[PDB]
Design a protein around this ligand. Structure first.
Ligand SMILES: [Ca+2]
Ligand code: NA
Length: 936
């Protein structure tokens, strides 16, 4: 009972054509570096173990002895070697991601599988080297771990190394030297390394669009940033093998549609369904009990939509897209609730259908994708931090069905699924070249295979924009193993280093030079054309879509046999400067593809991308403007309150810093009750000694005298925020600290203080590496970073507190790009240690209960708050509230205080305290009874 494979029904990358030419991997070794594997899975088997490189643990150990490897172990005929390079970690091993990635590369499920179709990877007859690596300490130790796994994989005979992991926005230059030399070691040995681009979209994450003022929104990190690697983006073909559900339309026909199910529905059981809108209100699920809730994708989370139907008593849920030509999204598991994602067109069909009955099928079929041929929304954009072109190539990575833990199978999306397909195509192409080009070195075949894969890759085309997807999103195009296995030509840059042209900074007139390489015995003629395109802009945001400018005339080129010729396409986009600079004031990309055809009417034979930037890329601002300078009071990750644009509350009692992510200075607010308790030596203060809290706030913000619930920005006459410290060790506004939202990566971040008289009085420790805030999510990164090394305690380089005055707090940082000038941002910081002189005597009129102070406060900095506090006990907890002064200078003291429980507590005169604070933080707190006693 031999079952058909998934590839037998769906092979979007044409792997079968290459397999018919180069085999299925028998005798070859490939390696996978991931976070953990199910090394017992049924997908790990060989058809003929006798044809393998390592036929036993003895063959594996002999190879270990020859290279000094004293670790790792044979597992079975398929998994010839497994080693855990992060065994010292305390976290448990996750087996799903690594098993899935490996299955796409070399899965070989037998016919005895429970699945409808067998999972057969690109190289099912190759042996696997599974190597675990996970973060335990830092990213340097991490890169040192997988550098060893690379070297070991090379020395154990791996022809391909697939690395379906990464860390966003990281620069290649910051990798340890061992990691860099391991990349070169594999390359010098003809071993291919394939990296996933990442699932981080652009700056802002898969839910935001980057602002047009900042074109350097790439988020590709390491190891993908290594030039030696082949970095793979993710796209969706126009069709995909999917699970199905069928209904009856109004025309009396049977229409079956794709579904993506979390948990399982009853196979071929007729389900009823009712429309429940966006699933936000309880009334939406009025007639949802017993049926399936049809919920529109909208404003609440999927977990909220699904759980709300569970309360109403539904048997399942159907969430349909709110985007046009969108992608399926894996819905969460909410208490085993069967949840299926469907397209917007299929959802609207179900919404306006008469006989609202749907039946889920057990056998999957190939159906068109709603997205059509489209790049994945999560696939990481270039460029690298160093400014290099990534990714290199695209591969299918939407809802890929592969092997998961416990001998099971599941669909996963991600560039981690795109990579192992290209890795398998690299391995087969290299085998093909071992007979097609035997006189080459292994490094020469590797360089050729990478160039052929990129050249023959079909440049994907956005049908809505009438332009090709940006090279910064798709690389050199979608991999095509048929065109790659058949290619006898390839195209490289001017210096024959890569199949991509990096032009760095360009003006309106530039030229793209490409070398066409012919390896056939006969000369060949080609027609070539360069497309000119840039970014599409929607107002203040990038659309993350191409904007075609024009295309050049088709020109001919004849390349002699076993030779190469260069072509040059002049580009002139000067007639677009005015419009493009209006949308993208700080510069814009000028990019595209030089496409090659045997004849202009035939299909694309090769394509090489070129990328230039119209401006000064390296000197683009790396730091978002301070939040104080915002016209409307909002930044990229922070929205203002339109009713009060100067409101800027602090951290409060939040646990995570998900709010208030912008460039600013931080300080601390320390109430007087805590200053008093600390100076008196109280050990336990929080929720015991005082009801007030020490809050981290932003410098230049001050609370109103009556509310205290909100802080507001105050500014000098010029406009700068009134940032002031009082360095006296009491914890109340003693320091300033730099908080940054970095639009670009930076290096050598250092803060200094100028005395505004021509002298630097203080310099902080240097923060050598700065990573951009490419998102505002705990799962990746927050939209802001607090650099504790930039904290200034108001002291000079000798340790003495600076004299009272205004100082320039200067933050310096340099972009990663080559030769970039150092950038800086300045803040005026006032230092004032002057303790306010306040009253020492007071008389209290018993009739009106008005307290009269012997003298008004005399403060150096302007008065911040002049209040009288009363601290009463509310359920054994001293609770403090405040009283503002009258207009004659007196304070009316109440005789009772209403508690939270609704009661009333009498106020004794020993409960009142006179507190005066200036805008630098200098504070005095005197008991009112002490003032009343202030008389000889
Ligand atoms: Ca202070
Ligand atoms: Na291409």
């Amino acid at each position: 009972t031999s079952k058909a494979t998934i590839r037998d029904l769906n092979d979007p990358s044409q792997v079968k054509t290459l397999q018919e030419k180069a085999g299925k991997g028998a005798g070859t070794v490939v390696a996978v570096i991931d976070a953990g594997f199910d090394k017992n899975h049924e997908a790990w088997r060989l058809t003929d173990k006798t044809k393998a490189r390592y036929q036993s643990k003895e063959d594996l150990e002999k190879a270990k002895k020859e290279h000094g490897i004293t670790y790792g172990e044979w597992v079975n005929d398929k998994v010839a070697y497994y080693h855990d390079y992060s065994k010292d970690g305390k976290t448990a091993v996750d087996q799903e991601h690594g098993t899935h990635v490996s299955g796409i590369l070399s899965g070989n499920a037998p016919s005895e599988t429970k699945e409808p179709y067998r999972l057969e990877g690109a190289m099912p007859e190759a042996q696997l080297l599974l190597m675990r690596v996970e973060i335990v300490n830092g990213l340097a130790d991490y890169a040192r771990n997988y550098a060893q796994a690379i070297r070991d994989a090379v020395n154990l005979g791996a022809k391909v190394i697939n690395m379906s992991f990464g860390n966003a926005a990281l620069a290649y230059a910051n990798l340890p030297d061992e990691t860099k030399k391991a990349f070169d070691y594999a390359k010098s040995k003809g071993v291919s390394i394939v990296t996933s681009a990442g699932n981080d979209s652009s700056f802002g994450g898969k839910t935001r669009l980057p602002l047009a003022d900042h074109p350097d929104y790439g988020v590709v990190g390491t190891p993908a940033a290594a030039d030696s690697t082949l970095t793979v983006a993710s796209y969706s073909p126009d069709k995909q093998l999917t699970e199905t559900a069928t209904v009856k339309t109004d025309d009396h026909q049977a229409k079956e549609m794709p579904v993506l199910s979390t948990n399982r529905f009853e196979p071929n059981k007729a389900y009823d369904y009712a429309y429940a809108n966006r699933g936000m209100k309880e009334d939406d699920f009025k007639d949802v009990k017993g049926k399936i809730a049809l919920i529109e994708r909208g404003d609440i989370d999927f977990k909220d939509k699904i759980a709300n139907a569970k309360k109403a008593g539904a048997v399942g849920v159907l969430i349909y897209d709110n985007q046009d030509k969108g992608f399926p999204i894996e819905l969460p598991n909410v208490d085993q609730m069967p949840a299926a994602f469907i397209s917007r067109k299929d959802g609207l069909l179900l919404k306006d259908n008469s006989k609202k009955t749907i039946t889920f099928n057990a056998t999957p079929k190939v159906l068109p994708t709603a997205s059509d041929t489209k790049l994945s929304r999560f696939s990481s954009w270039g460029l690298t931090a160093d400014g290099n072109i990534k990714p290199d190539i695209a591969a299918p990575g939407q809802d890929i069905l592969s092997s998961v833990a416990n001998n099971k199978y599941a669909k996963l999306s991600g560039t981690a699924m795109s990579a192992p397909l290209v890795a398998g195509i690299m391995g087969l192409l290299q085998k093909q070249y071992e007979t097609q080009y035997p006189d080459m070195t292994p490094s020469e075949r590797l360089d050729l295979a990478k160039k052929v894969l990129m050249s023959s890759a079909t440049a994907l085309y956005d049908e809505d924009e009438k332009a090709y997807f940006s090279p910064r999103q798709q690389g050199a195009g979608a991999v095509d193993a048929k065109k790659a296995s058949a290619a006898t030509m390839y195209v490289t840059d001017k210096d024959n280093t890569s199949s991509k042209v990096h032009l760095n900074n360009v003006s309106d007139k530039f030229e793209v030079t490409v070398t066409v390489h012919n390896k056939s015995d006969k000369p060949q003629e080609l027609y070539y054309q360069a497309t000119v395109q840039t970014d599409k802009v929607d107002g203040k945001h990038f659309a993350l879509a191409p904007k075609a400018l024009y295309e050049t005339s088709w020109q001919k080129i004849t390349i002699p046999a076993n030779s190469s010729k260069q072509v040059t396409v002049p580009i002139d986009a000067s007639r677009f400067s005015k419009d493009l600079l209006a949308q993208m004031k700080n510069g814009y990309f000028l990019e595209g593809f030089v496409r090659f055809k045997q004849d202009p009417k035939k299909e694309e034979l090769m394509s090489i991308p070129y990328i230039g930037f119209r401006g000064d890329f390296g000197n683009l601002s790396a730091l978002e403007k301070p939040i104080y300078d915002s016209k409307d009071g909002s930044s990229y990750y922070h929205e203002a309150n339109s009713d009060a644009k100067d409101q800027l509350d602090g951290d409060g009692l939040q646990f995570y810093a998900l709010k208030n992510n912008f460039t600013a200075l931080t300080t601390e607010s320390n109430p007087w009750t805590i200053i008093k308790a600390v100076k008196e030596g109280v050990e336990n203060i929080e929720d015991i000694e005082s009801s007030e809290i020490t809050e981290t706030i932003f410098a230049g913000t001050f609370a109103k005298q009556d509310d205290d619930s909100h802080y507001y920005i105050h500014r000098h006459a010029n406009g700068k925020p009134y940032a002031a410290i009082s360095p006296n060790g009491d914890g109340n506004r003693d320091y300033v600290q730099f908080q940054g939202t970095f639009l670009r990566n930076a290096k050598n971040l250092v803060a200094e203080v100028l005395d505004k008289e021509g002298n630097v009085v203080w310099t902080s420790e240097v923060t050598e590496q700065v990573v951009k805030n490419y998102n505002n999510d705990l799962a990746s990164t927050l939209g802001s970073t607090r650099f504790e090394k930039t904290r200034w305690d108001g002291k000079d380089k000798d340790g003495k507190v600076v004299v009272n005055g205004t100082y320039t707090y200067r933050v310096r940082y340099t972009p990663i790009s080559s030769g970039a000038k150092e950038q800086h941002t300045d803040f005026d910081v006032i230092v004032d240690n002057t303790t306010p002189e306040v009253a020492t005597s007071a008389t209290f009129s018993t009739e009106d209960r008005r307290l009269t102070l012997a003298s008004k406060p005399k403060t150096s900095q302007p008065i911040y708050r002049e209040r009288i506090a009363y601290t009463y006990m509310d359920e054994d907890l001293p609770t403090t509230e405040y009283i503002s002064p009258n207009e004659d200078g007196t304070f009316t003291l109440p005789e009772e205080a209403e508690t939270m429980e609704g009661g009333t507590v009498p106020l004794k005169m020993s409960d009142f305290t006179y507190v005066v604070e200036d805008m630098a933080g200098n504070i005095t707190y005197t008991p009112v009874t002490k003032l009343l006693e202030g008389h000889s």
